[PDB]
Design a protein around this nucleic acid. Structure first.
Ligand SMILES: [Zn+2]
Ligand SMILES: [Zn+2]
Ligand SMILES: [Zn+2]
Ligand SMILES: [Zn+2]
Lengths: 138, 89, 196, 139, 87, 203
DNA sequence: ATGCGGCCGCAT
DNA sequence: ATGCGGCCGCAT
């Protein structure tokens, strides 16, 4: 069997996973605190991102864009990609009859740009942008 | 696609299916997707995280069998993964 | 024709303002998710002549899953306002639209006028368009590429020609024998229509 | 009723009608090719506050487009709005009193139509023009 | 500081005329007179169909300054108002 | 405290009080540029012999016939308090038991009434606590110094709004006058000294 | 799909 | 100020 070096890598990966999760949740709660819903809609609009339906989804997409960058438009349909537990699914319309089925784990994205209005809250994030990309489950 | 959903109540208007008592907002709740006899589409039957296990459903690997599992808070993910084994308390 | 689920097939009749008759039927299909829904909308006027009803019906094609609502509209005319509002909210097109544009995620209107056709007869225009779409599907299967195009054409066809697939995901039209079977079905429909 | 005075008067009223029906054509085209949320996106993109009321929303959008995105207030940092005769400030200089700023030549950057509505931007035929707001010359 | 007469396209058809008491249609031209509200501290507009407004005995000399939102209307509508002001 | 007579339950009921706070607040809001000058009474009354609960709202123009009221019989013994707090925070922007009476823009401000011929007329909304009168005297001090400075009429407008809010006046349907004149400041300071003497008279 | 309650602009 | 109808997210 093997459960000494392999198991070590597994534990390290799960540790990084927990790190990313509780990081994004700290960010979400801080946004819940220092901002209102309309401010988050402003944020999303500033980064060329579509505005979803639902407060939860709004701040989720804001945190996503902030930590990993503003998701660029789709490759073919020019729609908008959204995280979905396991990967980024496209939510565009390749035609008036069918949904676009694009799906990736390394979408194209520019670096997020916090407007200067919330600089007072941007320092509340302590920057800490990090070059970390989205970590997905095994 | 999945058969089980889990999330923090997006509103306290929803009511549990076993105890029939209202679910509180921003609380952990688990649902099972079922065909809606009124229209073409699946709909979630919701449950308090405690009631969900008393209806006879058991999950082996929540990390793939349940939807939105990765979106929860970490300690909540571990609470779910623990209650999956055995049940309830 | 008055829909029987309203119960007013005897006590009332279907309305018609000008050339348009207030009795539309829309369908919406998506194979990736399995969606396959029907929507009947009627505006009925009493034989007496001044009670008005807005009848909505919806559900899964050729299945028990569905429901309906019969709303007695008080005003003799606001019923038409409600009818047009619902039509444009469900299909994205105006009631007297010169062109039946297809809007994304929204329904599509079917031209109507026993079991092989779950929603009733079909006009020769829809059947001609379905035959042309089957032509394109056959040529694209000969090309043997772009399964997304096959998905698109399959959705269009299953929308124009309803099928009773029960609770099962509609099958894609990548197979050639399937295209031949559906073309024979459309020829049968054409012969049945010319018989009338 | 001098002829020089009268010719200039007629010329000015002609330009006034031109600006009015221009802005109204723009408002109707926006009513057509866009929804309310798209106009809110537009306003937010130009640092502009989002008003309460569909009419006011598209009015402010047309204003910003034709003459430029109004900059924040001079003292209170609020938002200016057209009001028949001039631009009035709608900010709050304090928690007790409204700011009373009022001008006819506010500070403004050039409007920036997002590329999403480029399909509708060409529907405006550009035609931005260096025209500033024309006010009534009554008093 | 404020005017006495307002004019605008109905921001909704819920408002009802004050003379004929019949509902005003949305996006239609309507004229109002501001009056003190006996229920709270603030002025409120009494609305009128553009045709009814003149039968209540009010007459305006120079609409371009006496009425609020006059410049916001469409041009031909501004001229219709300026014409009906006379007679 | 005191039950407002426009509710008609001054006999059949009494004013409620949970702890140190008494459910009987009075807010005012003034804006000289527009002429606004509004009062708002909010009371939560409990039946003098039973468990019936009433939410009494009253509003209008200060010392004028213009206004109205609503008496809503709250069914629950406690949800009445929820409604009271909701209305308070919706009208003034502050919580009910706020340690600090912050002023929020466009919203009302709470007045401190002295719960427990001059008072009948000169004070349109009732007695005033010595704290409010002290603050008004300091604001008059600032107004006098700013008139001596002779600049910034917007500051004069701000101080005038603050003063007319803390000290209600029956201006009828007329726009309240600005306090740019020095004789006006002296008259209002004499008025406040009269109020202070009337208050110290009560022992 | 619709039902329904919270919300907000427009009347009064 | 509140009343009320249109609107939209969340339940079912
Ligand atoms: Zn796509
Ligand atoms: Zn339960
Ligand atoms: Zn200002
Ligand atoms: Zn009328």
């Amino acid at each position: 069997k093997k459960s000494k070096k392999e198991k070590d890598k597994d534990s390290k990966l799960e540790k990084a996973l927990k790190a990313q999760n509780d990081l994004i949740w700290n960010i979400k709660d801080e946004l819940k605190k220092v901002c209102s819903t309309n401010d988050l809609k402003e944020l999303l609009i500033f980064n060329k991102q579509q505005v979803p339906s639902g407060e939860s989804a709004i701040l989720d997409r804001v945190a996503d864009g902030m930590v990993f960058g503003a998701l660029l438009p789709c490759e073919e349909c020019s729609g908008q990609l959204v995280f979905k537990s396991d990967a980024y699914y496209c939510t565009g319309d390749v035609t008036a009859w069918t949904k676009c089925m694009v799906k990736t784990q390394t979408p194209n994205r520019k670096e997020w740009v916090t407007p200067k209005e919330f600089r007072e809250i941007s320092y509340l994030k302590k920057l800490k942008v990090k070059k970390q990309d989205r970590i997905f489950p095994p | 696609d999945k058969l089980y959903r889990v999330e923090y109540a997006k509103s306290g208007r929803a009511s549990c299916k076993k105890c029939s008592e209202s679910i509180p907002k921003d609380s952990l709740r688990m649902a099972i997707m079922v065909q809606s006899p009124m229209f073409d589409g699946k709909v979630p039957h919701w449950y308090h995280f405690s009631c969900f296990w008393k209806v006879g459903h058991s999950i082996r690997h929540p990390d793939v069998e349940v939807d939105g599992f990765s979106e929860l808070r970490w300690d909540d993910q571990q609470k779910v993964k623990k209650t999956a084994e055995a049940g309830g308390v | 024709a008055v829909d029987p689920d309203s119960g007013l097939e005897h006590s009332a009749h279907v309305l018609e303002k000008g050339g348009k008759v207030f009795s539309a039927t829309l369908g919406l299909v998506d194979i990736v998710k399995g969606t396959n829904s029907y929507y009947k909308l009627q505006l009925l006027e009493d034989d007496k002549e001044n009670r008005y009803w807005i009848f909505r019906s919806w559900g899964r094609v050729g299945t028990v899953i569905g429901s309906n609502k019969l709303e007695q509209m008080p005003s003799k005319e606001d019923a038409i306002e409600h009818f047009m509002k619902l039509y444009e909210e469900k299909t994205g097109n105006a009631w007297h639209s010169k062109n039946f544009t297809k809007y994304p995620k929204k329904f599509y209107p079917l031209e109507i006028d026993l079991q092989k056709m779950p929603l009733g007869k079909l006009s020769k225009r829809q059947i001609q368009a379905a035959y042309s779409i089957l032509s394109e599907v056959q040529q694209a299967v000969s090309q043997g590429s772009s399964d997304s195009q096959i998905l698109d054409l399959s959705n269009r066809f299953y929308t124009l020609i309803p099928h009773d697939f029960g609770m099962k995901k509609p099958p894609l039209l990548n197979n050639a024998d399937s295209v031949q079977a559906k073309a024979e079905m459309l020829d049968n429909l054409l012969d049945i229509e010319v018989a009338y």
